[PDB]
Scaffold this active site. Structure first.
Site, mmCIF file in Angstrom:
data_model
loop_
_atom_site.group_PDB
_atom_site.id
_atom_site.type_symbol
_atom_site.label_atom_id
_atom_site.label_comp_id
_atom_site.label_asym_id
_atom_site.label_seq_id
_atom_site.Cartn_x
_atom_site.Cartn_y
_atom_site.Cartn_z
ATOM 1 C CB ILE A 19 1.375 -0.505 1.140
ATOM 2 C CG1 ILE A 19 -0.136 -0.555 1.412
ATOM 3 C CG2 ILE A 19 2.152 -0.557 2.445
ATOM 4 C CD1 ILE A 19 -0.662 -1.850 2.040
ATOM 5 C CG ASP A 63 9.659 -13.402 -10.860
ATOM 6 O OD1 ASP A 63 9.031 -13.683 -9.822
ATOM 7 O OD2 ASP A 63 9.209 -13.809 -11.959
ATOM 8 C CB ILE A 91 6.028 -9.271 -2.541
ATOM 9 C CG1 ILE A 91 7.064 -8.316 -3.144
ATOM 10 C CG2 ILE A 91 5.722 -10.393 -3.546
ATOM 11 C CD1 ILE A 91 8.464 -8.872 -3.341
ATOM 12 C CE1 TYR A 155 -6.503 -10.904 1.654
ATOM 13 C CE2 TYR A 155 -6.036 -12.409 3.449
ATOM 14 C CZ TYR A 155 -5.619 -11.428 2.575
ATOM 15 O OH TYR A 155 -4.326 -10.905 2.637
ATOM 16 C CE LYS A 162 -0.776 -10.970 2.813
ATOM 17 N NZ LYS A 162 0.405 -10.113 2.536
ATOM 18 N NE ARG A 192 -10.681 3.349 -3.539
ATOM 19 C CZ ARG A 192 -11.839 3.987 -3.631
ATOM 20 N NH1 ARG A 192 -12.282 4.497 -4.783
ATOM 21 N NH2 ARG A 192 -12.583 4.115 -2.537
HETATM 22 N N1 LIG Z 1 -4.101 -2.825 0.165
HETATM 23 C C1 LIG Z 1 -4.539 -3.412 1.306
HETATM 24 O O1 LIG Z 1 -5.662 -3.192 1.771
HETATM 25 C C2 LIG Z 1 -3.615 -4.377 2.158
HETATM 26 C C3 LIG Z 1 -3.960 -4.572 3.515
HETATM 27 C C4 LIG Z 1 -3.052 -5.418 4.206
HETATM 28 C C5 LIG Z 1 -1.968 -5.973 3.575
HETATM 29 N N2 LIG Z 1 -1.749 -5.731 2.260
HETATM 30 C C6 LIG Z 1 -0.494 -6.369 1.620
HETATM 31 O O2 LIG Z 1 0.495 -5.345 1.379
HETATM 32 C C7 LIG Z 1 1.458 -5.777 0.273
HETATM 33 C C8 LIG Z 1 1.456 -4.727 -0.738
HETATM 34 O O3 LIG Z 1 0.237 -4.800 -1.564
HETATM 35 P P1 LIG Z 1 -0.492 -3.455 -2.049
HETATM 36 O O4 LIG Z 1 -1.840 -3.412 -1.496
HETATM 37 O O5 LIG Z 1 0.497 -2.383 -1.876
HETATM 38 O O6 LIG Z 1 -0.660 -3.691 -3.702
HETATM 39 P P2 LIG Z 1 0.201 -3.295 -4.960
HETATM 40 O O7 LIG Z 1 -0.462 -4.009 -6.118
HETATM 41 O O8 LIG Z 1 0.486 -1.806 -5.085
HETATM 42 O O9 LIG Z 1 1.596 -4.040 -4.637
HETATM 43 C C9 LIG Z 1 1.732 -5.531 -4.753
HETATM 44 C C10 LIG Z 1 3.108 -5.754 -5.285
HETATM 45 O O10 LIG Z 1 3.500 -7.206 -5.299
HETATM 46 C C11 LIG Z 1 4.468 -7.302 -6.299
HETATM 47 N N3 LIG Z 1 4.669 -8.680 -6.701
HETATM 48 C C12 LIG Z 1 3.794 -9.694 -6.987
HETATM 49 N N4 LIG Z 1 4.345 -10.835 -7.380
HETATM 50 C C13 LIG Z 1 5.668 -10.620 -7.388
HETATM 51 C C14 LIG Z 1 6.778 -11.523 -7.750
HETATM 52 N N5 LIG Z 1 6.665 -12.767 -8.158
HETATM 53 N N6 LIG Z 1 8.012 -10.917 -7.656
HETATM 54 C C15 LIG Z 1 8.227 -9.652 -7.270
HETATM 55 N N7 LIG Z 1 7.209 -8.766 -6.923
HETATM 56 C C16 LIG Z 1 5.920 -9.285 -6.991
HETATM 57 C C17 LIG Z 1 3.933 -6.498 -7.531
HETATM 58 O O11 LIG Z 1 4.908 -6.149 -8.403
HETATM 59 C C18 LIG Z 1 3.328 -5.320 -6.789
HETATM 60 O O12 LIG Z 1 4.275 -4.166 -6.819
HETATM 61 C C19 LIG Z 1 0.910 -7.209 -0.076
HETATM 62 O O13 LIG Z 1 1.679 -8.078 0.661
HETATM 63 C C20 LIG Z 1 -0.585 -7.241 0.335
HETATM 64 O O14 LIG Z 1 -1.051 -8.517 0.597
HETATM 65 C C21 LIG Z 1 -2.549 -4.897 1.473
HETATM 66 O O1 LIG Z 2 -3.583 -8.719 1.125
HETATM 67 C C1 LIG Z 2 -4.516 -7.751 0.745
HETATM 68 C C2 LIG Z 2 -5.532 -7.428 1.656
HETATM 69 C C3 LIG Z 2 -6.456 -6.466 1.226
HETATM 70 CL CL1 LIG Z 2 -7.738 -6.024 2.329
HETATM 71 C C4 LIG Z 2 -6.387 -5.858 0.003
HETATM 72 C C5 LIG Z 2 -5.342 -6.228 -0.867
HETATM 73 C C6 LIG Z 2 -4.408 -7.157 -0.487
HETATM 74 O O2 LIG Z 2 -3.274 -7.490 -1.216
HETATM 75 C C7 LIG Z 2 -3.366 -8.509 -2.196
HETATM 76 C C8 LIG Z 2 -4.537 -9.218 -2.347
HETATM 77 C C9 LIG Z 2 -4.736 -10.115 -3.407
HETATM 78 C C10 LIG Z 2 -3.723 -10.284 -4.304
HETATM 79 CL CL2 LIG Z 2 -3.933 -11.387 -5.654
HETATM 80 C C11 LIG Z 2 -2.517 -9.586 -4.196
HETATM 81 C C12 LIG Z 2 -2.369 -8.712 -3.122
HETATM 82 CL CL3 LIG Z 2 -0.874 -7.822 -2.997
HETATM 83 O O1 LIG Z 3 3.362 -14.786 -14.504
HETATM 84 C C1 LIG Z 3 2.035 -14.676 -14.022
HETATM 85 C C2 LIG Z 3 2.013 -14.421 -12.498
HETATM 86 O O2 LIG Z 3 2.946 -15.273 -11.835
HETATM 87 C C3 LIG Z 3 3.344 -15.045 -10.492
HETATM 88 O O3 LIG Z 3 4.512 -15.795 -10.065
HETATM 89 C C4 LIG Z 3 3.612 -13.548 -10.144
HETATM 90 O O4 LIG Z 3 3.760 -13.438 -8.705
HETATM 91 C C5 LIG Z 3 2.360 -12.752 -10.603
HETATM 92 O O5 LIG Z 3 2.484 -11.397 -10.182
HETATM 93 C C6 LIG Z 3 2.058 -12.937 -12.133
HETATM 94 O O6 LIG Z 3 0.758 -12.357 -12.482
#
Ligand SMILES: NC(=O)c1ccc[n+]([C@@H]2O[C@H](COP(=O)([O-])OP(=O)(O)OC[C@H]3O[C@@H](n4cnc5c(N)ncnc54)[C@H](O)[C@@H]3O)[C@@H](O)[C@H]2O)c1
Ligand SMILES: Oc1cc(Cl)ccc1Oc1ccc(Cl)cc1Cl
Ligand SMILES: OC[C@H]1O[C@@H](O)[C@H](O)[C@@H](O)[C@@H]1O
Ligand SMILES: NC(=O)c1ccc[n+]([C@@H]2O[C@H](COP(=O)([O-])OP(=O)(O)OC[C@H]3O[C@@H](n4cnc5c(N)ncnc54)[C@H](O)[C@@H]3O)[C@@H](O)[C@H]2O)c1
Ligand SMILES: NC(=O)c1ccc[n+]([C@@H]2O[C@H](COP(=O)([O-])OP(=O)(O)OC[C@H]3O[C@@H](n4cnc5c(N)ncnc54)[C@H](O)[C@@H]3O)[C@@H](O)[C@H]2O)c1
Ligand SMILES: NC(=O)c1ccc[n+]([C@@H]2O[C@H](COP(=O)([O-])OP(=O)(O)OC[C@H]3O[C@@H](n4cnc5c(N)ncnc54)[C@H](O)[C@@H]3O)[C@@H](O)[C@H]2O)c1
Ligand SMILES: Oc1cc(Cl)ccc1Oc1ccc(Cl)cc1Cl
Ligand SMILES: Oc1cc(Cl)ccc1Oc1ccc(Cl)cc1Cl
Ligand SMILES: Oc1cc(Cl)ccc1Oc1ccc(Cl)cc1Cl
Ligand SMILES: OC[C@H]1O[C@@H](O)[C@H](O)[C@@H](O)[C@@H]1O
Ligand SMILES: OC[C@H]1O[C@H](O)[C@@H](O)[C@@H](O)[C@@H]1O
Ligand SMILES: OC[C@H]1O[C@H](O)[C@@H](O)[C@@H](O)[C@@H]1O
Lengths: 258, 258, 258, 258
Positions: A19, A63, A91, A155, A162, A192
């Site tokens: 995203i 981090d 994140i 979830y 959240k 996705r």
């Molecule tokens: N994909 C969906 O359907 C959806 C819908 C609503 C909300 N979200 C939310 O949007 C955000 C982005 O997720 P996404 O779907 O883009 O997935 P994504 O996997 O592309 O991005 C998730 C990101 O979280 C980062 N992250 C995790 N732990 C971390 C830590 N300790 N320090 C620094 N960075 C860390 C990872 O590096 C990764 O870049 C999240 O908050 C997720 O819950 C996703």
């Molecule tokens: O919040 C989310 C909501 C949806 Cl529908 C899809 C992905 C999402 O994003 C996450 C879901 C689970 C974990 Cl372990 C980490 C992230 Cl970033």
């Molecule tokens: O180090 C293992 C895990 O620890 C978490 O604090 C991070 O947010 C996660 O992305 C990682 O997979």
């Protein structure tokens, strides 16, 4: 563009499906100057290349589990951007065992602790560490999901994390408003991404949502990016402490099924 | 009474001002058989004597920070009540430093962790430990506050913790409903209790609420007790996953002060 | 019972399946003295017979489309009950053409006017006509549906009218609280009644709700009746301006169909 | 600008202070082509002048109390704009006697009827009459107020009419989505306008909101105009059926400055 003159820091770019990548492309189209963070050294090169395609050379490790990593990052950012206009928090995390099956049987004290720490506390940890670097007119943004407001199968404890994050948006908007800072969230529909593959039966969610959503399609990172660009720009000056649903109308309907 | 034939466990009695004390007295008046827990040895004396006045001799120690303490307490309870009909969770805590002044400046990673662990995780930790002991028709109840929904000065990280708890209520009701258990909460208006004194300027919140609440008085432990008795009885069999406001109508009005 | 010493007026009894019939039965069991109204002479006989079974001989005609009919009914009630403790409003209507197919094609100016006049304005019209006959401690109650909060197929203009009714509950609780009156609603899940047969494909709503509701059954008039008796009793003295969901938790879940 | 290539109809310009005046100026800045309506002949001259200053000469009469007036207006519009991309509904009314003092004393059956007909029914009446003229990608927008959600002194029956309007936004979005049309609302904070000056003690509402709003100022027609332009553009393609709060965070806080 409507973000000309702004400097915004973007977290969470892991690949071109993220995203955050969508948000960064939209902000660059509208004229912002950008800076990026990356979680660990395995992501360093990919993020440096993404940033160069968008005209930036500001790429720093961070981090959010560690206070010292956050502080070190903002001190290095300060060498090039002593002041800036906000950041995008994209994140989230919970141990994989938390997200499958019955909620009461899957949740554990440690899993609940990690989910709330990385997905909710980290948003305010960043604001604490850069508070005196924010210009008046700055804006902070985070990403949430409908599982904060309703019980959704699988979830599980991420819905509780959240819900804490959405309350975090309101307490942060109330505390920082008087100094000229706004704070909001986007509640996105399912998309996705890399993390999406960790949700049990995410493929059925997507299909279902497409069928009963009023606009009859699931949303894109381009739809989320354009709304994020608006919420961090001066066009949204009257909006603070809000959770904006960017899900095509899914949450406001019931029983479209027959 | 309408709780005749029911066996309910009550946590959180610390004094005669306690919300849990008013819930126990209303449940006793309506015919329930009760069991009580106490946090530590400093409260043991008082809780044993209060239990005895309500005709009970089942009084067990339980600190919900520890998984071992919760498991041991239910194994002891199982010797006299092999099966029972639900429990009341009236427990909250955050370090004192978290509840005074600007929210972004006061909150800390460890303060957030403790607030969420004790005020929200513990409700589902008790449910996990006693799940197979619950009869068909059982009901669980917890206590929340308007700070989950709105930003309130000085309530600070406790607002985030209560948001996580109200989501906990929804996820628990959805997971446990099919096996015949209901789960709800009461969002109570402000009441002078021992823990209330820890909130900076609590006395001002109380005064304001008396003047602008629609019923023009603050609520009592008797008002909250009567609603708790109803929500744990078969009279409320159609209600589950709900957060019921017992605040005299305060949250539904705005600008009565004018 | 917990309604001993109270005098309550019940509108809307059409048959033994009516929600108002389940409410009257529950209040009679808890000790209330009851009085009844009937819309037209085709219902007169039945309602007289229903009242007689519950110990009452106070059966009065009233059509809430007319201000004069309300005033005359309360002047007749005044001969035996010059003072009383509140009423139950269980009335709704929209012309048949409004409830089938696409909402924008079906709604009309007159269709909209009638639906809001009978389903929403009549609640406050009855309050204006008996305001000085209410004792301190009185409670008013009305019935709503999830269609006020979410767009539901075929419910159409009735959803707008219920939204108007739920706001009416808040404005009436705020205005009448200071003199000692509480005002609330119950948002009931789907139940098979005479009026229910007027909603296109009501049988599908019923079966769908039964499968995905947390308690895994649809609610009954006994479930609704018991919650109504509580809300008009002194046990709910801390609750006013509230919309309580009595739908088994259906509204707080999402995507339960696997 | 981001509305280049769109054709939008604007209702409700009464003076330079009007919310629709700010909306028009912002849509003109972002490149839309505009057309305007005027209620009656006392407003015609001034609306013609304002339109001319924004480069428009499409100025037509429309009183939304009459179906014939709405139909004639859309037939005249059709001569220059056979197809177009949406409209802004910025219209409300209730008789002045409705807005002074205790709500239950002031509301009447006729007052209630007019309030809901002009402030809520009219939005869907306009959608019915131009439905076949809308291009895929069109967007419709109305203006609401927090009185829909909470009981506020003096706003009285207007709060019930706005709750009906917000439900109208959801039912409209759900019916028109599948054909390519989005429908949303802005819930604006208090702004000094001609209609605002008809509410008893508006001066006090404005001053109170200024002091307790998180951004510590009241919002402007420019703030509202910018959010309205975004919501009618393709930038907000992922948003439908939503009520966006543009009040500086006022609704998400409680007890500030206490
Ligand atoms: N994909 C969906 O359907 C959806 C819908 C609503 C909300 N979200 C939310 O949007 C955000 C982005 O997720 P996404 O779907 O883009 O997935 P994504 O996997 O592309 O991005 C998730 C990101 O979280 C980062 N992250 C995790 N732990 C971390 C830590 N300790 N320090 C620094 N960075 C860390 C990872 O590096 C990764 O870049 C999240 O908050 C997720 O819950 C996703
Ligand atoms: O919040 C989310 C909501 C949806 Cl529908 C899809 C992905 C999402 O994003 C996450 C879901 C689970 C974990 Cl372990 C980490 C992230 Cl970033
Ligand atoms: O180090 C293992 C895990 O620890 C978490 O604090 C991070 O947010 C996660 O992305 C990682 O997979
Ligand atoms: N008083 C109010 O105005 C108000 C309003 C709404 C909600 N609440 C909530 O009501 C509940 C009860 O609080 P109260 O106002 O009656 O105060 P209280 O001080 O009477 O009760 C707090 C209880 O929490 C218990 N507790 C704390 N930590 C514990 C731990 N680790 N293990 C076991 N027990 C622990 C204490 O022993 C005590 O019995 C809380 O959840 C609080 O947030 C209070
Ligand atoms: N049945 C359901 O699933 C359900 C669910 C939620 C809410 N509700 C609501 O519950 C209430 C009770 O309806 P019900 O389901 O028991 O149906 P019902 O058909 O048994 O009762 C409807 C009642 O409305 C009365 N009525 C209509 N117009 C009237 C007028 N002008 N004057 C006086 N009385 C009038 C009728 O006489 C009848 O007694 C309604 O407000 C309905 O909207 C029903
Ligand atoms: N000013 C505020 O604080 C505020 C806050 C929230 C919402 N609103 C809403 O914003 C909208 C615009 O009002 P405003 O504050 O800009 O006031 P205003 O007095 O400038 O505009 C009101 C407009 O309503 C139009 N109108 C009334 N009856 C009509 C009829 N029968 N046919 C056609 N047009 C009719 C008038 O011609 C006028 O142009 C309304 O829906 C109002 O409820 C205003
Ligand atoms: O949640 C509460 C809300 C209010 Cl208005 C008053 C008291 C409350 O209860 C607590 C407040 C702070 C701490 Cl540290 C512990 C508890 Cl139990
Ligand atoms: O509001 C209702 C909701 C449901 Cl699920 C079922 C029946 C309902 O009640 C009515 C529905 C339509 C009409 Cl014309 C009159 C009434 Cl009383
Ligand atoms: O809805 C409003 C809300 C506010 Cl705070 C200020 C102005 C508003 O607009 C109106 C208020 C009353 C009437 Cl009779 C008509 C209109 Cl247009
Ligand atoms: O008189 C015809 C109709 O008028 C409405 O006011 C009544 O609410 C309805 O029950 C009846 O069908
Ligand atoms: O040790 C300090 C604290 O830790 C606990 O987990 C809290 O519940 C609190 O009651 C106790 O005093
Ligand atoms: O003429 C009285 C009123 O009737 C209208 O329908 C209104 O919308 C209002 O602006 C006009 O004053």
């Amino acid at each position: 563009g409507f973000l000309s003159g702004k400097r915004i820091l973007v977290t969470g770019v892991a690949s071109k499906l993220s995203i955050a990548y969508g948000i960064a492309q939209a902000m660059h189209r509208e004229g912002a100057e950008l800076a990026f963070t990356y979680q660990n050294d395995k992501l360093k090169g990919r993020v440096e290349e993404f940033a160069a395609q968008l005209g930036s050379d500001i790429v720093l490790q961070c981090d959010v589990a560690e206070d010292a990593s956050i502080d070190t990052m903002f001190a290095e950012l300060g060498k090039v951007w002593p002041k800036f206009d906000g950041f995008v928090h994209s994140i989230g995390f919970a141990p994989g065992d938390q997200l499958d099956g019955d909620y009461v049987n899957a949740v554990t004290r440690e899993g609940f602790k990690i989910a709330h720490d990385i997905s909710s506390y980290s948003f305010v940890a960043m604001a604490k560490a850069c508070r005196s670097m924010l210009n008046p007119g700055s804006a902070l943004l985070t990403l949430s999901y409908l599982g904060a407001e309703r019980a959704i199968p699988n979830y599980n404890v991420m819905g509780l994390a959240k819900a804490s994050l959405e309350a975090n948006v309101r307490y942060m908007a109330n505390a920082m408003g008087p100094e000229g800072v706004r704070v909001n969230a986007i509640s996105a529909g399912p998309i996705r991404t890399l993390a999406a593959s960790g949700i049990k039966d995410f493929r059925k969610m997507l299909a279902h949502c497409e069928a009963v959503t009023p606009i009859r399609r699931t949303v894109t990172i381009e739809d989320v990016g354009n709304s994020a660009a608006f919420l961090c720009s001066d066009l949204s000056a009257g909006i603070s402490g809000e959770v904006v649903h960017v899900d095509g109308g899914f949450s406001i309907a019931a029983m479209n099924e027959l």
